[PDB]
């Protein structure tokens, strides 16, 4: 709905800075509603509900397992580690990293995972084999949050990374069980309260992940609908803004409020 526009326009205005946003029907992948959608941006922690995608996809494919264990040390922790920093003496198993990786925000879990796939040019390679030629990641963490102006490193398009977590939610990219285990970590998020899930309504279902990275970048991708299942994915980037971070939640939480207005 135009009245949705009006706020994600009035956030980019507010923000002096640019917005990206798309609004999904996530059975038929109509696009609802969008403002620059095919621009890019920096997509900070949201990639890495493609990464453990593409652990899914190895996992499907005999090449992974959910309860293989990975030993790393000291070494290995980057900043931002909240759930890695406390199993340093016994490690963590593939599907206890995705799950700090999208629920909480945990770069060691992060570069972990990655190193289990190949490393961003195989994140990338995964995307581009299931349509994707827009979606990259090029550097691994802290470092792909740099989000340098006009930098297309690390960076989606609203409407790429909408259809990419349509497709790996619902398509046959992933099995039944690989489908359900990447939207219930999603659903499970605990660090994007401020965000979308402040304007949901009771008895709505929601699946996200939010991202903040350097420069004002800031961003959330969900699937969210009413009765308990999501029939939407909407995604929400900017960078470049000088504003708080108070400030840029508050936006993202209003456009998520027009939007569930006018469903
Ligand atoms: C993704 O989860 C990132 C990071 C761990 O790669 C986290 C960081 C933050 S807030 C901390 C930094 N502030 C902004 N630069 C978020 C968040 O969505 O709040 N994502």
Same mark, same amino acid.
């Given at each position: ?168 939610? &619902? $398509?046959?990219?992933? +099995?039944?069980?690989? %489908?359900?285990?990447? !939207?219930?970590?999603?659903? /499970? ?49 900017? &960078? $470049?803004?000088?504003? +708080?971070?108070?400030? %840029?939640?508050?936006? !993202?939480?209003?456009?998520? /409020? ?6």
């Amino acid at each position: 709905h135009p009245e949705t526009l009006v706020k994600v326009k009035d956030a980019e205005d507010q923000l002096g800075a640019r917005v990206g946003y798309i609004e999904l029907d996530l059975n038929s992948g109509k696009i609802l509603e969008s403002f620059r959608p095919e621009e890019r941006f920096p997509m900070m922690s949201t990639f890495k509900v493609l990464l453990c995608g593409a652990v899914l996809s190895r996992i499907d494919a005999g090449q992974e397992q959910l309860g293989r264990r990975i030993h790393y040390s000291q070494n290995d922790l980057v900043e931002y580690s909240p759930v890695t920093e406390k199993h340093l003496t016994d490690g963590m198993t593939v599907r206890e990293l995705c799950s700090a990786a999208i629920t909480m925000s945990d770069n060691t879990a992060a570069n972990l995972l990655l190193t289990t796939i190949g490393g961003p040019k195989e994140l990338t390679a995964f995307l581009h084999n299931m349509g994707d030629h827009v979606t990259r990641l090029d550097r691994w963490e802290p470092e792909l949050n740099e989000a340098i102006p006009n930098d297309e490193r690390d960076t989606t398009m609203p409407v790429a990374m909408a259809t990419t977590l349509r497709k790996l939610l &619902t $398509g046959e990219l992933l +099995t039944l069980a690989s %489908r359900q285990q990447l !939207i219930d970590w999603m659903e /499970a998020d605990k660090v994007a309260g401020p965000l979308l899930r402040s304007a949901l309504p009771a008895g709505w279902f929601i699946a996200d992940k939010s991202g903040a990275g350097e420069r004002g970048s800031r961003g959330i991708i969900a699937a969210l609908g009413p009765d308990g299942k999501p029939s939407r994915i909407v995604v929400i980037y900017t &960078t $470049g803004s000088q504003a +708080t971070m108070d400030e %840029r939640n508050r936006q !993202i939480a209003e456009i998520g /409020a027009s939007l569930i207005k006018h469903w």
